[PDB]
Ligand binder design. Structure first.
Ligand SMILES: N[C@@H](Cc1ccccc1)C(=O)O
Lengths: 147, 147
């Protein structure tokens, strides 16, 4: 239940999250009221989860990023790694994954030594072994596709 | 230098990219003309890179996400895989990495069947071998942290 109009709306809003209701109304052939109300239904049905500025991580002092794959030191202990790691602010994302590892994290940090301290924090807070893959360059990211 | 009132602004806009320049000014303690001019300057030094609505991928038909680690088949050839894959819309992100593979992609697709098709297209269009790690669930993503 996403009609043609809604796909247009989410496509425009993925490319430009600050687009005004009136720019959107003219692209969709709707009134500004019609647009607001379709946008409110997109948000409350959880199709649109929120809006963010895309911040350049380097510009704010995050000069090093990494994938960290984690696996429980004790797989019989309950499985709450994501909730435990939620209070660690340098953890930007957490996915559960098929394979030998349990979770993959994306982590951002100021430097190599800051990474070594963060890995210790991640091993003790989730009781986990870590396998780190350092990112050397981001060619493009977050390019959301609406088919 | 990021004039740490500037840190309040990026912090606020990362959390709510549809914040208004006036509902901002009160939260930061400035005047619409200052707020507006910083934001335009932040956008000009590529600190804020865009604004986007965060779309739920499964709401839109992408019921299968995967990391796809790729490595060029022939190292005598120019390594231009990111440029070559850029036109493939199901690739959301591309990173070079220090690990076992040369690059990691984040890919989104309708089904396991559609992934197999996509992996064939990736192999033939960029001349790479692939290795996919299927995501089961996303616990949180894109929590941009501003120190
Ligand atoms: N990696 C496990 C799935 C899993 C993820 C996270 C926690 C526990 C299990 C598998 O391939 O079956």
């Amino acid at each position: 239940a996403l009609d043609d109009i809604d796909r247009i709306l989410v496509r425009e809003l993925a490319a430009d999250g600050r687009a005004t209701l009136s720019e959107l109304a003219t692209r969709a052939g709707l009134s500004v009221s019609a647009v607001q109300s379709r946008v409110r239904r997109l948000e409350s049905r959880g199709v649109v989860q929120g809006y963010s500025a895309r911040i350049n991580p380097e510009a704010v002092g995050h000069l090093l990023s990494a994938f960290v794959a984690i696996t429980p030191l004790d797989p019989s202990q309950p499985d709450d790694a994501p909730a435990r790691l939620e209070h660690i602010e340098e953890v930007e994302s957490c996915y559960s994954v098929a394979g030998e590892e349990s979770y993959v994290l994306l982590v951002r940090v100021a430097s190599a030594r800051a990474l070594e301290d963060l890995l210790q924090r991640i091993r003790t807070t989730a009781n986990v072994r870590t396998r780190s893959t350092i990112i050397l360059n981001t060619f493009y990211s977050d390019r959301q596709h609406i088919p």
